[model samples]
Target chain A: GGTILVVTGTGTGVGKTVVCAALASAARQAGIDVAVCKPVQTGTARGDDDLAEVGRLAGVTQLAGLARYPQPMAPAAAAEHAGMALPARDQIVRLIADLDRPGRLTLVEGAGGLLVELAEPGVTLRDVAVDVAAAALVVVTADLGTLNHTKLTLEALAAQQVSCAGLVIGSWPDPPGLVAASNRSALARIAMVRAALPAGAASLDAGDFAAMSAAAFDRNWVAGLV
Target chain B: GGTILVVTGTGTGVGKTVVCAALASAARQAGIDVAVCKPVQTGTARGDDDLAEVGRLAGVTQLAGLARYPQPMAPAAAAEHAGMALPARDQIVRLIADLDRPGRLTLVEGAGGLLVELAEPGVTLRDVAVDVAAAALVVVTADLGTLNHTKLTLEALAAQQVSCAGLVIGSWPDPPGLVAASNRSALARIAMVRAALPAGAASLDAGDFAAMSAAAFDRNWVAGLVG
Candidate 1:
């Protein structure tokens, strides 16, 4: 099986998509084969999915999405709203297990926060990550209320006894404000910061995106995991 | 000691002050003596604390704020930024204990979320509530992303072994949108909602605010808790 990295966020729209792309780009720059897996995609019926966005930004063509729903809510809620059946835990495990190729990296991005119900009642990404023994990486916002949200998310991951990769600031502003600047030091006290992607890294071309990811991440630290 | 209901929100600016006022008004209308206690007030030096707003809206004069900081941030963070010492845990416990009296309901409204550091490093309202043995009431937003925040807050309260009174939608809009409407049912699936205060409840006169609160809250449910 490949090294599976599960990417989750503190809340919705916290740049999980771009962070996964950045991780894939950084891993690929180190001469490692990387693939992105989106377990669930919401707010889109087809096309323009998260995997497509990752491919466009990172130029990593190896990608897969297990399930998709058309509403913008959490996966289970969206499925319920659209009258669709969600993929069970076993199915998700099988999909990721099938994607695991020896000596490659598979990044599994969850729909929203760690506790969001992915498919069934009380089934969250934490359960999937725990069952698959994947290393979890949490993406967080850089603002006033981020400290509590980050701590709570990390505590939830910890309660499941999941191995955490590190924390990532999804969108770091150009000129950080007082709250953002102060929160940087406060957050550093809680977890190791793997990378702080610039505010507009998503709009860059593939080459620049890759370069920015490399610059944002600690090359030695990221390579050590693989 | 009196029954203390500590009001905390999912995040800042979620109308915790108004919710506190509503609870006070409802408890008062039920012939229960209620006092609102704000442990810490940030972003104001004096004259405009949350308790003052509660007094103005609910017309309940028995109010207290133990500490005040002028910056608009979390209590601990605001104290740090202003180079002031936070009121220690023991100080907060003593203040609330003083407010506690037989047949009286003391409502201690927190500055921000459940896990926000209040006085010291890693010390939150959860600690204060635990030490005082108070029932925690979470105030949340009625919007798209509320489920996760509300769940996280409830989980934090559970982790601390705190007793949850119930949840309150701090400021329910006049015409609820798709997201808000969806979230109301979704939130009910997770926790009991004691009340969903109207959006403009804060702007109403004293008599109108009291009447609105009585209409919004489940009278028997609230009375049962206090009685």
Candidate 2:
């Protein structure tokens, strides 16, 4: 009965996990209960746990997920390499549905990008968002090709009629070179830049991360979510 | 009319020219005549000639070109640097349409990604594909973020009613680790993976490149591309 947001990136390693943590930390600081769910997690073989990372930085206990493939690959390939299949679409939707409750902001994190299959027969996070009736917060990079990728991801979300909450530059570099400055302005033209997390905020301690997260987003917007 | 395919990439430096060369070679070996047209080429400052690369790699003699900007930037920026303007859309449309001939497979290469401006008044390769009635053969990578870019390119193609011939992984790395192998399979799931040209393919000489190109595609498909 509360706001549900799906956090996805233009591609992998654009810092989707850190953005999730930042948002959760932000929401929690606004006195809102935050629960982050990663439906299908890969790279457990290398101990890649996004939910765990979110829990650590956001300091919110409610971290939920479903399947965990050992290899650091897309859910389908990781599943196949580990000799398994991803969960069914209904199964993923049910997990998020159960996580929802009054006065709780449930954040769903996707694997890789919007189209990476988290379920059988090419079901993706975009489809999962539609199932759970959630808006999407697109995480992007401030680089040369970010504009194209951001536009494409936004178009894909629009194709499914998914509400794009806003855009977040995952890593905002120091000194903010010409390209980064140019890209940030360009990205703002695409969508509301909810926040551009200071570069290397992920490497900060929990207290530092909370402080940065609280300051990153608008307090009014965070309060309005729930 | 011939089968005109606009070879475009997901982004810059994704090995689009090599895929064009490889496709031309496969079509040629299947007894189909081939021609490659590059309407606008940037990076002349660094001596980047995509048309020449295709000729050297695939050994196709019918290589046509147009505008050249010395700076190695995007078409608009490069044109600005050269104190000139982008080619008129008419020039681009007319060239590809003129090159179209019965029983010949013509490839029109784009300057950058699908949405990059190639002609004046904010025209793109997608616009040209619509003008020339050509299907797009999207070139992509086998790295971590390929699926997202590949899907985005294909979606953009479909949005304009431009047929997506298939996707070509321009540079499939040797000793493919988990990511590359995973992307190859995932890319196939999205669209047809026509070829995954080995890395360093651009460096291959004419003879070896032609051979690799010939073997890179399905013999029947290449032959069927022509009437």
Candidate 3:
């Protein structure tokens, strides 16, 4: 058990899951024993749907999925309406403990973007990262307007005192447009984004759970990321 | 026909329209005649439901409604998906001008929150607000973890140098959560917020359109807000 990496975003659909899975797969290929967790999720299909996708993409079978909610909005409202208790800090602490048990590099994925509230005025997706003392990777869109969004996300993380491992730019079309590529340059210039990953990796689009799992389990791509 | 108040939120369900309507009511009670214009709206229920609600609440029957898109999403996405030509800047300017010409206090309510993309990467709701030269009244939720959201929204608005008419704290349960109320104090301490309005106004929940209309035209509560 060692330092865990938390992947987050600036907003929804910016692709935190895809970045986490890709990094996980790359880490696995680099011969790291990885354990993954998606601490909280809402608006997902069902029964570890997002986790299953992550595990399949990263090729990690040793995964512990916890805290799944169905509400499409913020967690507090969803949990309140359903009459379910919000995930306690202790429950998350336990998850971190398990993942960090021994000889494991835990990678936790936060639902929604950074600063998104998990429980009203109490917990946010970022709080989970802070709680586990993980190095964070802010996943940003690789298109226009990313400069402003990436800068804001970085500033927020810095304000929260979260150690940043750098940014990962996702969702770049194969034949990148002028605006998308411009955003990449702007991110590198304004924010400390480590790399801009193209969108067409086999792990990103593949539907075969097993193959996706295998690709995700591979870790060569991120071997030099640290 | 004075300055327009373009009210928006940081995100959806923040009760921006409610706050705007309240402002209208507050303004009307202060003896100011007010009118409203919503230049572009997505996911509307038809026949100006939101505007009607605001008009009913603010007591302003002279409501000038604008384009409404069917899909309920960001204005840019819904517009592009539905092939609705984005409203021209001049058209929106004219709409605000037309409403203001009657010597009424016009409040233009925007769809979604500020910084929302009206056209990908280039235009945002902020741009729309600026084009109309409207003062902003940012309506935020008084829920758990609002500190961060309110701060972000304030910072964005400040960055644009748009004058603020304080904040309206929405949906807070009484006695109110200490932490939640504390967020307001913190924001106040930071010199970001001008004032914070508590939730649960009698004019807000009265579903009767007539009552809403009566309240809408009353602005006594908000007269002191204008600097």
Candidate 4:
């Protein structure tokens, strides 16, 4: 009864966390109960908490997470540095399933890219997406190489039969130069360009964030998500 | 008689041009003739000439090109801005075929990544490789997301049944940091790393570039690319 979307990016530092918060805020304002779950979170030693940021921006009460590591590295490497094993594949799947409920929107954010190992035995978000039967909302960049990376990510998703929800420009630069402007146009041709969240949308306080989120996405589309 | 290899990368500026030049230099130094072909080049308005760089650094005179656009965008985008169409698929195929001589190694460098469009109707470097029955040499970086990008690139090649001629780390950083060192080590686990050219190897004189290229890859492998 609930809609679960696995938010994945082309790579790290492409604004996956900000996209998660923006999306959660949009869905929450649409009167749909939203749950943000990050299976594996790294960089706690540096106080990188994506869940908390989502809570602050979107006011998502039902936040869930399983593994938290101290180092700011890929889940596998971070886990190894901390002398810990990544959570079992089943553990991550069950956590999201437990959070799933009728009429709710569940957002599962991935660690790095779609193929980074988030669990034991080298299982990735794509594998989890296949197991959960959820669609993937790929968050992409508006940079020079975004087209190739987006195509690669899309091809990988289709190979495993994962439903691709659409593409979101996680951060759209203000006054986009020639290259960035060209990439955005090209990206739309490849996949549905859901929304181009204004650059620095994440830095806005709650009052400003909610208003921005309300207008950032299409009203009908946000309403239809649930 | 010769082997044609298409050199592609995970993204733009992943050092694909340099990789092509390095491999060509190594192969030529092994007493094998080498030819480099660039099907489409962009950013010529800014004087971004990859063929010139390859010739300058590798000392190979057998360089060919099909199309040039002034904008530094993808071939498709730049072509649109230039009011010209990209070279036909057949034109690219024939050029590479003509370059394939006995006892030579012909290296074709793509404009961007393997999946970037090189022809109308969305034909890509991957499609070109398939058309020419050429293997792919994926150039990558030793950075945070190297593993995923490399795996994605390699997976795409396998899907098209394009044989991969190992991987090349485009720029291996000096005094490598933790992430780069770990990434380079991790890359070895994915495929054989033919070479990791030292950073800034692109700007060196031709003599130095030739010497570094010879030391970058396995000598036997360089000789084996031709026959």
Candidate 5:
């Protein structure tokens, strides 16, 4: 019913958590009620840690439910071995509903990469994000070999037909060296990156939240997106 | 009937070569024969370099053969672009036989990562490795977030019914940081990590054939492997 923000990445460790946390904080600062949930995490003490971190930063304390698998592997491999399919669509929809009360915004941080397997039947992390109708933010790093990785992620998103909010370059080292700066410029040129944040910068800045608006962030760029 | 080792990892760039080289060199040092092969590689240059490096480091002059694919993408994606089915099962069987010379210990490396896709029909890299009937030694990094990654790799191997030669800790930055050391012992205790090497150590010390022996390497690790 509210704005559903989905944070994902080109690959693992690209800063999906950081982006989700920052978006949550920015929303709260804008005076919007926000709820968060991380449906699944493997190999972590709690599946909801990232969501909790977002809650702490955004100051939204209610965590209705978090799902975790013991194997610390891809959701599909972990789930199959445990004889379970990736959390069923209905189960995830219920979780989103649980986080849906009286909020102008709901932020869901997905596990692993966008293409990561959820379980048997071959559903991916992106499938869940799209099923929930969340506007996706693809988090990427400013480093060597990012162009190919970035393109592939974009292609996959297009294939899945998710509503992307434009790219966010996170954790880029300061003084912006050649490679990092090159990546940012490249990303901006290929398609406008809605926003880029310095490495380790807290995600809650107001300026960052404004960048989340698709029309304002990439009026022309969104038109070009498939 | 000799040792057969599977080189594996959770994600690419985790150093599957390091494990293959280490096992190869370690077996040679223990006076056991060693042979190697890499069935599928998306980008020919990188795959060739990896195979060459393994050959150089392991000191094994003869290679089982390397299957090269030109596109630098996932094998499945690459195959789709190339419009080809994966190699026939007989081709893989024949390839395995080519590497399994009498009394020679063998090692094979899978492309990309454990579950990397090789064809559009949804065939995976692990499917090829399993077809070779080799035990797996999943190479994992011991960085800040390695435990989860390593566990994922290990579970994939187990699901395929491949025996574990244990985890090989690759690319440690300094003083063998907390996660690397902890993972090595933890994997050894819990899963099946048999040996650990600091970053770049396994690659450098490999290729010492005269130093290997069958006793130093575990046949039991790959005893059930069939190709």
Candidate 6:
């Protein structure tokens, strides 16, 4: 069976989508059949959702969004606002299972942070990860207040008994400030920092994005997981 | 004897100091003796610290900071950067106990979020609240991403068995955006929103600040916390 890697962030706008794209690009470069799944995509009416952006940036053709809500809020809230039913956890699990193939990695991107309601009241990406036994990659910011948020998310993941792949500093600044510089080192104390994606990776062209993603992550280490 | 309400924000620049001033001013207007304690003040070498600001804004004469670190970071990290030792938790517990008097309310303002290291490694405002059995009032932002941070802080408080006073929006914007308006209701689903302090509250004069604080909070509700 293929491996499923769930990607969540410390909070929204923490470059979660960019991190997912990078992960997919890196996996694809290693000759692994990689797929990306966004369990719930919000802000669809705004255009340019994560699924489309990942497809363009990561160059991964296989993509899926189990549910799409119009508003840019938590999936549950957005779905309710749009008068849409949420995709059940079992439905998501089945979809990922179908997407999974031997020697392939399915990167599951969550809507928001680990605890944000993805479907029902208690359902979250954390629950899906737990159910699927997937390794969770927590994307964090490299700024002043990231330590507490990162720690909280990690602790939440640990409490759920979800295996954390590592922390990824999404959108690391080019000329890092004091806090970002310090946070990189401080975050490592909490969990293994798998990669630090450069700040403008999202804006990069496909070819450059692929090369940058490959350079950002340790392909050998990620390959070993599969 | 007296009630101690520890005020901690989701993160820095979340209006923690302003919230402390507001709470103090509100409690004082209700004729309740209020004091503010900043266990560890950071970035003081750069300028005035939270204690001074709270004192100036709220007219809180009974203010104390157990330790002051020069760098603007987590207290432990700041202490390390400044090459100074952190004030022990016991030392802080003693000072708070000393400040706690019957018929008074002591509002303890933490440096950053609930989990930010205050005086020692792994020790946080959560530990202090638990040690003193004080009710923790979490100050949060009124913006798009407030839910997760607020929820995490509340969950951490719950995990530590700390009594949560309630949630307070530290700096509620004037022309509230979609996310802020939505978050107001969304956050209520997680914890009771005690108050939402207005934006630019820190810039208010002492008299205005005191009056605004009194009107912003439910005085009877807060009084009940102490009694």
Per TM-score, the best of the predicted structures is: 4
**Which stretches of model 2 miss by more than 4 angstroms?**
B66-91, B117-123
Can you tell me which runs of candidate 5 are displaced by over 4 Å? A1-12, A21-33, A37-204, A213-226, B1-4, B42-48, B69-90, B101-103, B172-174, B202-227
- The local lDDT score (0 to 100) that residue A50 gets in candidate 6 is 90
| Chain A vs. native, model 1, TM-score | 0.96
Candidate 1 lDDT tens digits, B1-227: 67888999888788889999998888888888888888889888544489889999888899887888887776766788888888888888888998888778899999877788877657788999999889899999987668888888888889888988889998898888767888898899899998999888888998899899899888887676565
Q: In candidate 4, what are the lDDT values of residues B83-138, reduced to their tens digit?
A: 99988888889889989988989999998888999987888989999988899999
List per-model TM-scores for chain B: 0.96, 0.98, 0.80, 0.98, 0.78, 0.97
Evaluated on CA atoms against the true complex, candidate 5 attains a DockQ of 0.08
C-alpha TM-score for every candidate: 0.96, 0.90, 0.57, 0.98, 0.58, 0.96
lDDT by residue for model 2 (B1-227), tens: 98999999988889899899999988888889999999999888898999988888888899889899987766776787679999999999888988899999999998768887788766888999999889999999998878878988899889989999888989887789877877888789889988889889888888888888888887877787779
lDDT of model 4 at position B172: 90
Q: Whole-model Cα lDDT per candidate?
A: 0.85, 0.89, 0.64, 0.92, 0.61, 0.86
Best by lDDT: 4
TM-score of chain A of 3: 0.83
TM-score of model 3 (CA atoms): 0.57
Candidate 2: clashing pairs of residues: none
lDDT per residue, candidate 3, B79-183, as tens digits? 766787677666777888887744457888877666654444446556666776767777776654355555566667666777676666644555765446555
DockQ of each: 0.60, 0.44, 0.08, 0.85, 0.08, 0.60
Give a tens-digit lDDT track for model 2, residues A72-179.
878888888889878998888998999999999999999998888789878999998998899999999987667677877998999999999999999999989755
Cα lDDT tens digits, model 5, A143-192, are 65455456556656665677777787767687887557656776775555
Relative to the true structure, candidate 5 reaches a TM of 0.58
Per-prediction interface RMSD in Å: 1.4, 1.9, 7.2, 0.8, 8.7, 1.4
- Candidate 6 CA-lDDT value: 0.86
Docking class of 5: incorrect
